[PDB]
Amino acid sequence: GYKMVNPPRVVGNWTPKDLSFEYKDVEITTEDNVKLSGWWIDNGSDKTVIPLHGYTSSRWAEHYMRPVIEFLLKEGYNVLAFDFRAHGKSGGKYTTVGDKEILDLKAGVKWLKDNYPEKSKRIGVIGFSMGALVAIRGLSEVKEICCGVADSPPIYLDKTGARGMKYFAKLPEWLYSFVKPFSELFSGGRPINVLNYTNSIKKPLFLIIGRRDTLVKVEEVQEFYERNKHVNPNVELWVTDAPHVRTIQVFPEEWKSRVGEFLKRWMG
Amino acid sequence: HGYKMVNPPRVVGNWTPKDLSFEYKDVEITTEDNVKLSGWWIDNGSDKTVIPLHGYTSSRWAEHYMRPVIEFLLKEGYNVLAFDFRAHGKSGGYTTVGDKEILDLKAGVKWLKDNYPEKSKRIGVIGFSMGALVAIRGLSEVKEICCGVADSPPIYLDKTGARGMKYFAKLPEWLYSFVKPFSELFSGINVLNYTNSIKKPLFLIIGRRDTLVKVEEVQEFYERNKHVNPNVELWVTDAPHVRTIQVFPEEWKSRVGEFLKRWMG
C-alpha cells in the first residue's frame, strides 16, 4: 500500500489585488508547530468568513476559491484564506488523509481571535469538496465558528474513491498510476467520514450537493442531513443541477443568492 | 490566470528492503546545490552497484517497476542504491522543469565514491520513463557510470506530451481539474543530441503498445547512436509504457541480467 502521500503542490498567480481589494500576507502557526501561509483580507467588517479548499488545490483554486473570495468581499465580509498544510505555500510535507487539517482551521480561527477580535466577532466557514469535510468538522470541534457551508462533501470516502477510478478504466494505466496512490488510500475505508459528526453538530449548516455529482450521491448527503436533523434544527440542504463542486461557476447567481442569505441570517 | 507553479507529488510506500529479505540503511544524500535526498543503501556484499531511477510522478516505491527491479538486482548479487529524486517521496527541494535530476544522480554517484568506494567499483543505471532520460543523460556526463539501461525513454517530449493530453481529454472537465497539476507538471529538448556523445554500453527498451513513446522514435535514437557506439542495444517489446518488466518478467530479467554481467566488468 501507501504510507504517506501528497498531491502535486500548486500555487496560482492571482492576489486579492486583482479583485480590487487590499490584503496582507500572513503566517499562521498551528498547535503542532506547522507554519501555514495565507491571506488576511481586511474588509472593514466585524464578520469573517474562512474559505477552505479541496484536496488537490490551494487558496488560489481558480474553480471555486477565486469566485467565492470575490463573492465574500463584495458582500462586505472579511476573508482569511490560507493553504492547508502540505498545500500551496504552507508548511508540512505530507497530506495523506488530511485528518490534521482541522488543526489548520483551529489555528486560523485562533489567529483571528488573538489579533483581530473586533474583525471576527462572527466567524463562518465555507468548504469545497474535501474542504467541506473540514468545515463540517469545524462546526463540531471549533466553538468560535458560528455557521458553515459545505459544498459537495464526500459522505462515504471509500465509495467516492471507487467512483473516481471508473473514469480511468478505459484509459491507459500510466494515467491511473497518477491517482492510484491517493484513490487506494480512501478506498480501503481507513479515513473517518463526516457521518462521525452527525450528533455533535448543533450549529447552522448549509449542505450543497449536485444532482449530477457522480462522486457524491444526493441520497448519501440526505443521509447526513436527517441524521443531524435529530440534533440540529438549522441544517439546510440544496440540491443543484451541477456536477462536483461546479455549482459556484455553472450556476453562479443561484449559488451567491442562497449562500448569501444563509450567511446574512446566521452571521449575526 | 492559471498556475504560477506546480510541484511533483510525494509517494511513499509501505515496503522496505526487509520485505525482500535484505537489510538496508536509510541514507541522506546531499547534492551540490545543497538538496538533501532520501534513499536506501542496500549492501549485498558486492563491488558492483546499480542505481534504479524512477519516473517523474512516482518514487523508489513504485510497485509496478521499482520494487521488482530492486528485487531482481538484489537476487543478481548487485549492491543497490535507490533514492527518490528531489521533492519526490521523502527527498527535499521547487523542482523546476526537471533538469536538476542529473544533479541528483551525480550526488548518488559521489555519495557512493565517498562512503563505499570499494562497493562501487562498477556503477550502472536503470531508468524508467523520464527516469530513463536521466540514465541516458547520466551515461553521457557521469564518468563513474560504466553502463545504463533505458526503459521506455521519451524521445520527442512535445510529441509525447501531445499524445498524453489526448487521454487527459477523455476525462470530464470537473474531474480533470483534480489531475490538471499532473499535466502541467510535464509542461515545464533534443534528446537525440545524446546520440553523439554516448560511447558507453546502452540498453534501450520500448514497447509496441506504448501510447506515449513510439517504437520508431526510440529506434531513431538506436540507429543514430549506433555509429559512434558499437555497444548500444534495442529491444522492442509487446508491452505498454514501462510495463515490460511486469508483463514479461523472466524475459526482462534475462536480457537485462545478461547485459549487466557483460558490461559490469
Side-chain angles (χ1 to χ4, degrees), chain B:
Chain B
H1 222 303
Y3 287 147
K4 178 26 190 161
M5 195 225 144
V6 171
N7 251 31
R10 294 190 173 274
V11 178
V12 180
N14 282 97
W15 69 274
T16 61
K18 257 216 73 147
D19 307 345
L20 311 181
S21 291
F22 279 92
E23 245 307 305
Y24 63 100
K25 299 286 187 299
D26 292 326
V27 300
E28 193 94 351
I29 308 173
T30 303
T31 67
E32 61 191 87
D33 56 338
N34 282 110
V35 173
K36 297 187 178 185
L37 305 175
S38 174
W40 289 330
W41 168 241
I42 318 176
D43 182 22
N44 200 8
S46 172
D47 285 18
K48 311 180 184 187
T49 300
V50 180
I51 305 177
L53 310 170
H54 65 80
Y56 196 68
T57 57
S58 65
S59 59
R60 88 186 84 163
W61 283 276
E63 297 216 308
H64 281 311
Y65 58 90
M66 281 303 302
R67 186 172 187 171
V69 73
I70 289 179
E71 179 178 333
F72 154 74
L73 287 169
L74 287 178
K75 299 220 287 186
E76 276 281 351
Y78 297 100
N79 299 329
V80 172
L81 174 69
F83 60 88
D84 312 322
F85 281 113
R86 55 184 72 199
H88 295 75
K90 291 183 170 181
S91 301
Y94 62 90
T95 319
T96 57
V97 182
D99 223 320
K100 308 151 68 184
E101 311 218 326
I102 185 60
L103 298 181
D104 301 336
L105 179 54
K106 286 182 180 178
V109 167
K110 161 171 289 298
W111 183 92
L112 289 176
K113 294 296 183 172
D114 280 19
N115 299 36
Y116 306 94
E118 200 279 325
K119 297 175 169 297
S120 56
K121 294 178 175 296
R122 304 299 184 274
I123 301 181
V125 285
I126 303 178
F128 295 85
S129 188
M130 290 297 297
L133 288 187
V134 183
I136 286 181
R137 178 174 180 175
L139 192 56
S140 174
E141 300 176 3
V142 184
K143 23 204 263 176
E144 296 82 354
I145 306 180
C146 61
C147 64
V149 180
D151 197 325
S152 308
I155 303 305
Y156 297 93
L157 298 178
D158 60 336
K159 279 177 196 205
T160 296
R163 302 181 186 106
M165 248 315 295
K166 295 283 187 173
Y167 297 104
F168 269 101
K170 312 304 281 184
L171 289 176
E173 188 280 313
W174 54 266
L175 181 56
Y176 172 66
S177 58
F178 284 137
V179 307
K180 182 175 178 56
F182 283 100
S183 183
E184 307 236 9
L185 185 63
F186 293 96
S187 299
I189 79 161
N190 210 0
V191 169
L192 294 181
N193 261 13
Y194 290 105
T195 48
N196 284 26
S197 58
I198 295 184
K199 298 178 181 178
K200 293 176 179 178
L202 175 62
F203 187 42
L204 300 171
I205 304 177
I206 178 63
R208 293 184 178 93
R209 301 180 185 269
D210 197 319
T211 54
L212 293 178
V213 188
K214 288 186 173 182
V215 174
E216 338 167 10
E217 297 167 327
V218 178
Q219 193 168 16
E220 181 182 359
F221 194 103
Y222 171 74
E223 222 77 47
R224 285 189 178 274
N225 184 253
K226 243 284 176 172
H227 30 267
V228 292
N229 183 20
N231 297 324
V232 51
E233 300 181 13
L234 177 63
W235 183 26
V236 181
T237 63
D238 183 65
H241 199 65
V242 303
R243 273 297 189 269
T244 297
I245 197 179
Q246 191 160 245
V247 174
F248 310 104
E250 297 179 305
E251 280 74 13
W252 195 97
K253 297 172 184 177
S254 178
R255 284 188 167 90
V256 174
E258 243 199 291
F259 174 80
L260 290 182
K261 243 226 181 302
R262 177 64 180 86
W263 300 120
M264 300 291 287

Side-chain angles (χ1 to χ4, degrees), chain A residues 23-238:
Chain A
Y23 70 99
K24 299 186 188 64
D25 282 320
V26 298
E27 186 169 328
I28 307 175
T29 304
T30 71
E31 67 181 23
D32 60 336
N33 209 27
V34 180
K35 278 160 316 180
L36 306 176
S37 181
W39 291 327
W40 167 235
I41 320 175
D42 201 325
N43 204 16
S45 178
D46 59 328
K47 302 171 291 295
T48 296
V49 183
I50 309 177
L52 305 171
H53 64 81
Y55 188 88
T56 68
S57 67
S58 63
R59 94 186 78 160
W60 288 273
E62 212 77 13
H63 284 288
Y64 50 83
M65 285 296 296
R66 183 169 183 171
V68 73
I69 287 176
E70 182 177 351
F71 158 72
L72 290 168
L73 291 180
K74 291 166 66 177
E75 290 293 307
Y77 295 102
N78 300 330
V79 169
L80 177 64
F82 54 86
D83 304 320
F84 274 136
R85 57 179 63 192
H87 291 79
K89 293 184 178 179
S90 286
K93 201 174 183 181
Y94 306 101
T95 300
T96 318
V97 169
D99 62 311
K100 291 299 170 59
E101 290 185 2
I102 181 58
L103 299 181
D104 299 343
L105 184 52
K106 280 184 178 178
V109 165
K110 175 178 172 52
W111 180 91
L112 284 172
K113 290 301 184 177
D114 290 340
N115 301 124
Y116 303 94
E118 71 281 6
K119 301 289 179 58
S120 57
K121 184 171 175 172
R122 283 297 182 270
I123 301 179
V125 289
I126 298 178
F128 298 88
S129 186
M130 293 295 295
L133 309 186
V134 187
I136 285 182
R137 186 178 180 178
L139 292 176
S140 174
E141 305 197 11
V142 185
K143 259 209 169 140
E144 295 298 339
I145 306 178
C146 71
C147 70
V149 181
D151 198 310
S152 308
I155 308 301
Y156 295 94
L157 288 174
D158 61 311
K159 298 178 182 299
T160 293
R163 290 159 187 167
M165 34 175 282
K166 287 177 181 174
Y167 291 96
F168 296 84
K170 296 169 173 293
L171 301 179
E173 270 295 313
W174 64 259
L175 183 51
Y176 181 60
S177 61
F178 291 168
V179 294
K180 182 175 181 176
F182 306 92
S183 62
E184 274 291 332
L185 272 200
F186 289 89
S187 292
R190 73 143 167 199
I192 310 296
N193 294 327
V194 277
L195 291 172
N196 183 252
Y197 310 98
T198 58
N199 287 11
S200 54
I201 293 174
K202 298 176 178 57
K203 294 173 180 177
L205 171 59
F206 193 19
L207 298 168
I208 300 177
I209 183 62
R211 214 182 319 272
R212 299 178 165 80
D213 195 329
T214 56
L215 300 180
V216 188
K217 295 188 174 183
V218 175
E219 336 200 296
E220 293 179 342
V221 179
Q222 285 175 319
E223 181 179 330
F224 181 96
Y225 172 76
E226 244 160 39
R227 265 162 152 262
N228 188 244
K229 179 59 164 59
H230 286 75
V231 191
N232 178 26
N234 306 283
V235 50
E236 304 184 34
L237 177 54
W238 173 37

